[PDB]
Design goal:
Subcellular location (chain B): Cytoplasm, Cytoskeleton; Endosome; Cytoplasm
Order of helices and strands of chain B: HHHH
Number of domains of chain B: 1
Number of helices of chain A: 0
Oligomer: heterodimer
Protein name (chain B): Polyadenylate-binding protein 1
CATH topology of chain B: c-terminal domain of poly(a) binding protein
Number of helices of chain B: 4
CATH class of chain B: Mainly Alpha
Organism (chain B): Mycosarcoma maydis (Corn smut fungus)
Helix content of chain A: under 10%
Structural class of chain A: little secondary structure
CATH superfamily of chain B: c-terminal domain of poly(a) binding protein
Shape of chain A: rod-shaped
Number of strands of chain A: 0
Radius of gyration of chain B: 11 Å
Family (chain A): Belongs to the UPA1 PAM2 domain-binding protein family.
Family (chain B): Belongs to the polyadenylate-binding protein type-1 family.
Strand content of chain A: under 5%
Chain lengths: ~15, ~70
């Protein structure tokens, strides 16, 4: 696939 | 920067991912964020396109962590 299982976890911001 | 571009699109994609994968949403969203912005905008517009990308990332991740 084009997706990498080595990708960084997405972290949402908060105020 | 492209990084903040992706991060911002990630902010919109994450809750949609989490609604079907609440444990892996962070990792699955991050994987999906490899895709170009036009494709990410497409996933935000078409829930069934996002769903299929989530399923793909799920299968890639499982193969990575199992065998």
């Amino acid at each position: 696939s084009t997706l990498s299982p080595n990708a960084s976890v997405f972290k949402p911001s908060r105020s | 920067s492209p990084e903040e571009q992706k991060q911002m699109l990630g902010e919109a994609i994450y809750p949609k991912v989490a609604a079907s994968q609440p444990e892996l949403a962070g990792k699955l969203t991050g994987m999906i964020l490899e895709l170009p912005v036009t494709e990410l905008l497409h996933l935000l517009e078409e829930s069934e396109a996002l769903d299929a990308k989530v399923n793909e990332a799920l299968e890639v991740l499982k193969e990575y962590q199992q065998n």
